[PDB]
């Protein structure tokens, strides 16, 4: 088992650390808004499908299933 | 030859599509007239 | 040359490299086993040798052993419990890693002299991986010691004794015979933390050897 | 001259991914001993007594990725050789 | 509003989410890079070839588009067909299962797989590391990641159009054109807002409320939806997602109709106000 | 002990799935080929860009191949006989409904082709009417795949 | 209890709806498509304003998906077996529906489309043209949507 | 148990295999040969490029024979009652996909032929249409084999 | 034991077997054979070279005996209703594959007859097609072979 709010916590700091300090730092050159632009639009969709993925696992309804074969395998490989 | 090339060009397409009609079509007007710039570039040409 | 030899540069090296290597060669191929016994009210059922082996990287969850049920003759598997192979595993691979590295670094000091003393570039960035490596031998140190102090709770043969269902029946009193040696792993780890004592030293002494 | 570069690049690409490729699979038959959710095939019909002969299947499977990765790297050998005919 | 600094971006990660492959993006971005390294080269170089022409053109497309190809088969833990074993997976052990009322069925098992019922008591919860590896052997995986796919696909889509809809209003007030506000955006954002958004916090609000234990009569995001767009209410037979949703769902279908006289003659109207004004 | 013979309302269901897409894949191939060997001769410049309306010739077999590859798998030893019957619906359905656009599509690009012949910028409008057939087969993908898990 | 063939009669009303109203787009489609390529060479003006008989096209698709939801919605595992002719009812109904409305507005859109070809002003008169046939379309949908509360 | 004789069921579906995919090469035997033999006159130069498409029918029939081979192979009155109507399901769905792949190809190699006739540079196009043809009979062979073997 | 009179399904396979590739090898020997006496009149002496395709529908025929024989020798009194079954299979799909390649033969020869009647350096190429024509009913040849011997 896993606790859920460690992976939460640590991608939302990295992340929005990430798409906050970026913009800030970068140089002033004849580019700085399209690359500031593309920063800050990879941040927040890409934490967006992340957290999509995640909180998709979160609660099962149903659990899957496994062969028989396969079951009496991992029964000695691991846990 | 299969995946990296056809199942890679049908998904790029279909993505271009997406937002040729579905991103652009919502606020980006189509009409308009690209400029031509002049120079002796040309004479590379 | 000689000086170098001479010099407390690599003679600390070399010592270093000679526990870290002797450390982690006991660490990687450590074994054991401990043994007990079972005995229920039917004398023809009771097993009286039950022998479990255990080795390294300590996955207490995958060693095991097929007990006696007590029950008609039969018999049931018995497994025991708590994962240490990750802690242990990184306090090994890293060990290589810095075998490895250290190695390099009396390479440098025997063979590369002159390029080691060229522009004083080599001594700063081995320095710096040092420092590196002295952080990130403490948390695994750290880890490994807390990790041991897991297994030694692990190692409790009354904690096995009443997962077993059939322990907690009438006429079912299980002995440990001969119980586990963890005086291997406590030696492993003293040599841990004399490698990283003596990396801490032995950063001061780069650091003071840059100027 | 003989067999010269641009036919013989494929070669060279071909088996420096495939010995890429075959090491890394060796690696995962040998050491994870081929876990079933990375290989489910196996070539056995009675594992009643225990789980020590699928062990020693996956080290004989994982035995099976040396030749390969060998003889491509010696095809890849030839190939470079080839290419360097010019 | 140049779309460039926005297609740059999205158009790779639509293509990586459609593309969710991992050693196949590193191939792509291989060959990518191998064209990087010989441009100056192939720019002083003839080639007839025309689809390469266009190939390396968008070179600057392809290398970044691959990097995200790269990145989303990390998610999916889809890298040729399987997927890294991180071992995590926290779902079956020995005496969990033989302590849920079992034993030895796999004596039969050898010609039947008996699925497990969920709820055990101490397994389930997150997978930091993307999707369980556990799925790709099971063969019901098929719903897991049907349904999976088809929410995030939806939601994606969802957000995509609502983002890029905005940029009306760059358009709008560069332009002094409220005109296009007043009878127009406005509305259109409400329509949509309500519409999509709706079923998105419906879905987020299912996923963070009920678990498999209430699995019975639990509804499902289509009924309501269909429900809701159909007019149609049962009396009964069918527990509500929350208490009180029927008067927030009839406010949310006669304010989409609201929406609707304001774009089509208010415009015309007022248009034809300021005409005969000037007339 | 379910009823014999009951395995094949999956079995056949996919097949025609299939069937119709493989049907209606071939019949755009068939007009795009006509249309692109009609412009080419005459307007080179347009060759790969009348490629477009070929890669959208094997959509068709994408969505059936979707299909029929979910049939295949949810296919078993012994159906509950509920949803075979979906399956044999939802197969028919995409699979028709895929052959339907397939002609669209075919007829569409012999539309662009004699379009562009002498005017290049109608391209825009061929690919417009293009997208506005497949979003059929699409349709189709949905019902047959909610009809699927049903 | 019940028959083991109880959802047959659902599946194919939903597959009969989706597929007629396929067909019926298609072959709007159809016609628009090359009615347009052809008005569109002559002249470039109304190329992307020829696009509302598509529009109509579209909407005789989001037809048969309607109908194909109520359907999938009141479809179960053992039907009453007095609902699944209804769904197979109105499947048919709607969809042919569509199909009518289909070959409506193609054969008028080509008409209009060509028509207009030297008179700017019937655009609009075929417009209200093809404006009844959606009509006829809803028309059908009515009698879709009374089978759908059944 | 088993229904007897279920075997008859493969026993068609490898015919019918076969079958489909012998008509589908022999249709586009017919249009290739027909077609270069007038033309390899005034460009006898693509006498050896019109060998690539008459090899893909050779394709066509191969997996016509593969399929057929392997249900075969399975074959037998020892069957389950859930694996020879697989065969029969497989073979009607490879079979006919080859047919459509005869289809395309034949006619596609009669357009292309002349295109290339005229214009050399229009033979790459013309290969990226046999390529899409044959990927087509790929898809075909990809849920024959995923029924056959299940 | 055997069931009453089972030997009659192969008792109409080598019938199959047989009339079908009549239907193949007379129409391969109708087309070349009629098109080569069209073309003698103008040059004679490449009249020998052009009759290659009409022993080769022969050969379609003898594909045809080859099974037929098989057939009547596995044919007995005491069938199993299997290898029945197998004989019709084997007769229906050789026959059917002669008469695909007496199409293709047919057509193919015609053209290419009169094609190297205006141009001589045509012929070997005509032939390959000509050869593919009878790999495709060496395939259907094998088929039935493997059903023959099951």
């Known amino acids: 088992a896993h606790s859920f709010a460690l992976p939460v916590i640590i991608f939302t700091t990295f992340w929005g650390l990430i798409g906050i300090a970026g913009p800030w730092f970068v140089p002033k050159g004849p580019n700085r808004g399209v690359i500031i632009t593309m920063l800050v639009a990879t941040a927040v969709c890409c934490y967006l499908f992340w957290l999509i993925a995640i909180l998709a696992q979160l609660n099962p309804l149903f659990g899957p299933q496994l062969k028989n074969e396969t079951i009496w395998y991992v029964r000695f490989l691991w846990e | ?21 579905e991103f652009q079509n919502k606020f980006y007007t189509g009409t308009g007239f690209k400029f031509l710039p002049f120079s002796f570039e040309h004479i590379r040409e | 040359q000689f000086r170098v030899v001479k010099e407390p540069l690599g003679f600390v090296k070399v010592l270093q490299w000679v526990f870290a290597i002797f450390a982690f060669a006991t660490c990687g191929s450590y074994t054991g086993e401990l043994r007990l016994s079972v005995e229920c009210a039917n004398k023809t059922e009771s097993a009286l040798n039950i022998e479990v082996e255990f080795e390294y990287p300590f996955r207490l969850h995958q060693v095991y052993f097929d007990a006696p049920s007590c029950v008609k003759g039969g018999t049931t598997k018995i497994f025991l419990v708590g994962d240490y192979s990750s802690s242990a595993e990184f306090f090994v691979t890293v060990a290589v890693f810095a075998f490895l590295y250290s190695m390099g670094a009396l390479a440098t000091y025997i063979f590369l002299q002159n390029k080691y003393r060229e522009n004083n570039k080599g001594p700063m960035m081995d320095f710096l991986a040092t420092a590196v490596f002295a952080f990130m031998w403490l948390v695994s140190s750290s880890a490994w010691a807390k990790g ?8 409790d043969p009354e904690n096995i004794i009443k997962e077993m269902p059939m322990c907690r029946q009438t006429g079912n009193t299980c002995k440990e015979l001969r119980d586990p040696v963890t005086s291997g792993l406590n030696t492993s780890v003293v040599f841990g933390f004399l490698n990283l004592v003596l990396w801490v030293g032995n950063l001061w002494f780069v650091f003071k050897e840059t100027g | 001259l003989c067999c010269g570069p641009k036919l013989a690049a494929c070669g060279i690409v071909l088996s420096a991914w495939g010995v890429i490729m075959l090491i890394m699979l060796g690696i995962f038959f040998n050491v994870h001993s081929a876990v079933l959710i990375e290989d489910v095939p196996f070539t056995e019909k009675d594992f009643e007594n225990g789980p020590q002969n699928i062990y020693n299947l996956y080290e004989q499977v994982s035995y099976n990725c040396f030749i390969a990765a060998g003889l491509y790297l010696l095809l890849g050998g030839f190939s470079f050789c080839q290419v360097r005919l010019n | 509003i140049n779309p460039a ?3 740059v971006i999205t158009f790779p990660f639509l293509f990586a989410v459609m593309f969710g492959d991992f050693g196949h993006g590193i191939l792509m971005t291989l060959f990518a890079v191998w064209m990087v390294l010989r441009e100056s080269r192939i720019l002083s170089q003839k080639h007839e070839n025309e689809m390469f022409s266009m190939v390396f053109s968008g070179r600057y497309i392809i290398l970044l588009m691959g990097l995200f190809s790269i990145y989303t088969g990390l998610i999916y833990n889809d890298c040729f067909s399987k997927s890294l074993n991180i071992f995590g997976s926290s779902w079956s052990v020995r005496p969990m299962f033989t302590q849920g009322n079992w034993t030895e069925e796999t004596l039969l098992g050898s010609s039947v797989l008996q699925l497990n019922p969920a709820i055990p008591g101490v397994f389930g919860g997150p997978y930091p590391f993307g999707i369980d590896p556990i799925w790709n052997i099971a063969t019901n995986k098929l719903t897991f990641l049907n349904s999976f796919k088809m929410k995030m696909s939806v939601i994606l889509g969802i957000i995509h159009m609502l983002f890029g809809v905005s940029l009306s209003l760059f358009n709008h007030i560069y332009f002094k054109k409220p005109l296009n506000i007043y009878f127009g955006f406005i509305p259109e954002i409400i329509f949509m807002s309500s519409l999509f ?8 609000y299912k996923w963070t409320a009920y678990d498999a234990h209430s699995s019975r009569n639990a509804p499902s995001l289509l009924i309501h939806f269909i ?23 009839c406010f949310l ?8 006289p304001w774009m089509l003659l208010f415009k015309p109207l007022i248009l034809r106000h300021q005409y005969l004004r000037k007339k | 002990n379910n009823p014999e013979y009951s395995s094949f309302f999956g079995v056949m269901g996919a097949s025609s799935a299939m069937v119709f897409s493989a049907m209606g894949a071939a019949y755009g191939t068939a007009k795009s080929g006509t249309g692109i060997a009609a412009m080419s001769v005459m307007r080179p410049e347009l060759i790969m860009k009348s490629i477009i309306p070929v890669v959208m010739a094997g959509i068709i077999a994408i969505y059936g191949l979707v299909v029929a590859v979910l049939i295949a798998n949810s296919l078993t030893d012994g159906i509950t006989l509920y949803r075979s019957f979906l399956q044999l619906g939802a197969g028919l359905s995409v699979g028709l409904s895929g052959l339907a656009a397939g002609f669209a599509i075919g007829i569409v690009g012999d539309a662009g082709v004699r379009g562009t012949a002498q005017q290049p910028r109608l391209f825009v409008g ?5 997208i506005f057939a497949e979003v059929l087969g699409l349709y189709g993908l949905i019902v047959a795949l909610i009809l699927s898990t049903k």
Not at chain 5, 253 to 260: E, T
């Open chain 3, 148 to 155: 041991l102090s897991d297994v030694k709770m692990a190692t």
């Open chain 5, 197 to 204: 958004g709706y079923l998105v916090i419906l879905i987020f």
């Open chain 5, 253 to 260: 279908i006669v304010v989409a109709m609201l929406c609707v």
């Open chain 2, 1 to 21: 030859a299969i995946l990296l090339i056809m199942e890679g060009l049908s998904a790029f397409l279909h993505a271009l599509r997406l937002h040729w009609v």
């Open chain 6, 126 to 130: 061929m690919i417009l009417i293009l």
């Open chain 5, 227 to 249: 429900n809701m767009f159909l007019f149609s209410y049962p009396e009964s037979g069918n527990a509500m997602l929350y208490s009180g949703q029927k008067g927030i769902q």
């Open chain 5, 5 to 7: 600094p926005y297609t």
